[PDB]
Short mmCIF file of N, CA and C in Angstrom, two decimals:
data_model
loop_
_atom_site.label_atom_id
_atom_site.label_comp_id
_atom_site.label_asym_id
_atom_site.label_seq_id
_atom_site.Cartn_x
_atom_site.Cartn_y
_atom_site.Cartn_z
N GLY A 20 10.52 -30.47 11.39
CA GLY A 20 9.45 -29.36 11.41
C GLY A 20 8.64 -29.07 10.17
N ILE A 21 7.93 -27.98 10.20
CA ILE A 21 7.06 -27.68 8.97
C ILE A 21 7.79 -26.64 8.24
N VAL A 22 8.87 -25.92 8.82
CA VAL A 22 9.49 -24.91 8.11
C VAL A 22 10.07 -25.50 6.84
N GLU A 23 11.14 -26.15 6.70
CA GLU A 23 11.57 -26.77 5.44
C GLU A 23 10.33 -27.29 4.68
N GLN A 24 9.55 -27.95 5.36
CA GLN A 24 8.18 -28.50 4.60
C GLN A 24 7.74 -27.39 3.82
N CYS A 25 7.69 -26.09 4.16
CA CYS A 25 7.17 -25.03 3.24
C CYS A 25 8.26 -24.24 2.55
N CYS A 26 9.47 -24.28 3.24
CA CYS A 26 10.55 -23.40 2.59
C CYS A 26 11.25 -24.47 1.53
N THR A 27 12.18 -25.35 1.90
CA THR A 27 12.72 -26.15 0.96
C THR A 27 11.71 -26.59 -0.13
N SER A 28 10.74 -27.38 0.42
CA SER A 28 9.72 -27.81 -0.41
C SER A 28 8.52 -26.68 -0.30
N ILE A 29 7.61 -26.61 -1.21
CA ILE A 29 6.64 -25.40 -1.04
C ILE A 29 5.31 -25.86 -0.63
N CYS A 30 4.40 -25.13 -0.03
CA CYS A 30 3.23 -25.54 0.49
C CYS A 30 2.08 -24.62 0.11
N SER A 31 0.95 -24.91 0.27
CA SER A 31 -0.26 -23.84 -0.05
C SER A 31 -0.76 -23.32 1.16
N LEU A 32 -1.60 -22.39 1.13
CA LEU A 32 -2.05 -21.66 2.26
C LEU A 32 -2.99 -22.50 3.17
N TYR A 33 -3.54 -23.59 2.54
CA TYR A 33 -4.35 -24.52 3.33
C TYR A 33 -3.60 -25.19 4.45
N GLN A 34 -2.31 -25.57 4.00
CA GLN A 34 -1.41 -26.22 4.85
C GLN A 34 -1.05 -25.24 6.07
N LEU A 35 -0.42 -24.14 5.61
CA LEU A 35 -0.15 -23.04 6.88
C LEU A 35 -1.33 -23.00 7.77
N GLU A 36 -2.53 -23.32 7.18
CA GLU A 36 -3.70 -23.17 7.99
C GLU A 36 -3.67 -24.19 9.11
N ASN A 37 -3.26 -25.47 8.62
CA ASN A 37 -3.18 -26.64 9.53
C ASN A 37 -2.06 -26.26 10.55
N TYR A 38 -1.10 -25.39 10.21
CA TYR A 38 -0.04 -25.04 11.12
C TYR A 38 -0.26 -23.95 11.88
N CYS A 39 -1.48 -23.40 11.89
CA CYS A 39 -1.90 -22.08 12.61
C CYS A 39 -2.21 -22.55 14.00
N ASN A 40 -2.79 -21.64 14.72
CA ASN A 40 -3.15 -21.95 16.30
C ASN A 40 -3.81 -23.28 16.38
N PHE B 17 -1.36 -16.70 -1.18
CA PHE B 17 -0.01 -16.93 -1.81
C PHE B 17 0.16 -18.29 -2.35
N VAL B 18 0.24 -18.41 -3.63
CA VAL B 18 0.43 -19.77 -4.30
C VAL B 18 1.73 -20.22 -4.30
N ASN B 19 1.99 -21.38 -4.07
CA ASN B 19 3.32 -21.85 -4.16
C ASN B 19 4.43 -20.92 -3.41
N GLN B 20 4.53 -21.14 -2.21
CA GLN B 20 5.53 -20.09 -1.61
C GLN B 20 6.57 -20.84 -0.82
N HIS B 21 7.73 -20.29 -0.59
CA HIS B 21 8.94 -20.93 0.02
C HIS B 21 9.06 -20.07 1.45
N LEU B 22 8.59 -20.67 2.45
CA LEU B 22 8.69 -19.95 3.84
C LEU B 22 9.64 -20.65 4.80
N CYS B 23 10.65 -20.00 5.17
CA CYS B 23 11.49 -20.61 6.30
C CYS B 23 11.85 -19.54 7.32
N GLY B 24 12.29 -19.80 8.42
CA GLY B 24 12.59 -18.81 9.48
C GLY B 24 11.36 -17.67 9.60
N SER B 25 12.00 -16.38 9.62
CA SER B 25 10.89 -15.28 9.77
C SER B 25 9.91 -15.41 8.55
N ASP B 26 10.36 -15.44 7.33
CA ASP B 26 9.43 -15.69 6.15
C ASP B 26 8.21 -16.52 6.66
N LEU B 27 8.58 -17.53 7.24
CA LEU B 27 7.46 -18.55 7.70
C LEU B 27 6.55 -17.83 8.83
N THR B 28 7.32 -17.28 9.78
CA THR B 28 6.66 -16.67 10.91
C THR B 28 5.85 -15.57 10.41
N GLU B 29 6.39 -14.67 9.54
CA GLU B 29 5.60 -13.71 8.88
C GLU B 29 4.22 -14.22 8.35
N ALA B 30 4.30 -15.09 7.20
CA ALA B 30 3.06 -15.73 6.91
C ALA B 30 2.12 -16.14 8.04
N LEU B 31 2.78 -17.12 8.84
CA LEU B 31 2.31 -17.89 9.86
C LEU B 31 1.60 -16.74 10.70
N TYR B 32 2.41 -15.79 11.22
CA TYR B 32 1.79 -14.59 11.96
C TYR B 32 0.60 -14.08 11.17
N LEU B 33 0.50 -14.13 10.00
CA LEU B 33 -0.63 -13.59 9.14
C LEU B 33 -1.75 -14.55 8.83
N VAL B 34 -1.34 -15.71 8.29
CA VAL B 34 -2.41 -16.76 8.04
C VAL B 34 -3.37 -16.94 9.21
N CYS B 35 -2.78 -16.86 10.24
CA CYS B 35 -3.75 -17.05 11.58
C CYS B 35 -3.88 -15.45 12.09
N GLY B 36 -2.76 -15.06 12.66
CA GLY B 36 -2.91 -13.68 13.16
C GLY B 36 -3.71 -13.66 14.48
N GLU B 37 -4.84 -12.96 14.46
CA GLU B 37 -5.60 -12.96 15.78
C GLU B 37 -6.09 -14.42 16.09
N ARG B 38 -5.91 -15.15 15.00
CA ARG B 38 -6.26 -16.58 15.36
C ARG B 38 -5.03 -17.26 16.03
N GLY B 39 -3.95 -16.56 16.31
CA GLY B 39 -2.66 -17.15 16.91
C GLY B 39 -2.27 -18.27 15.68
N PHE B 40 -0.85 -18.41 15.82
CA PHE B 40 -0.34 -19.43 14.73
C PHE B 40 0.63 -20.40 15.56
N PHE B 41 1.44 -21.25 14.73
CA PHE B 41 2.20 -22.17 15.35
C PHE B 41 3.56 -22.20 14.53
N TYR B 42 4.72 -22.48 15.11
CA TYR B 42 5.99 -22.56 14.41
C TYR B 42 6.91 -23.63 15.02
N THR B 43 7.93 -23.97 14.40
CA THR B 43 8.82 -24.97 14.92
C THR B 43 9.75 -24.49 16.11
N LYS B 44 10.58 -23.44 15.79
CA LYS B 44 11.55 -23.03 16.81
C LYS B 44 12.07 -24.11 17.70
N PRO B 45 12.88 -25.05 17.00
CA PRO B 45 13.42 -26.06 17.54
C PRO B 45 14.73 -25.66 18.40
N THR B 46 14.74 -26.00 19.72
CA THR B 46 15.85 -25.64 20.56
C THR B 46 15.68 -26.17 21.94
#
């Protein structure tokens, strides 16, 4: 998934955007 | 939010906000 992708590793808001609706 | 560690709710929280009215997406593997 993308969870650890942003949790264990860290991500920017532009990525959480790609994971938005 | 610069460099953020989001997992479980912490991710849904931001997820819920990054998009919000724009709806968001999550893993919820089960």
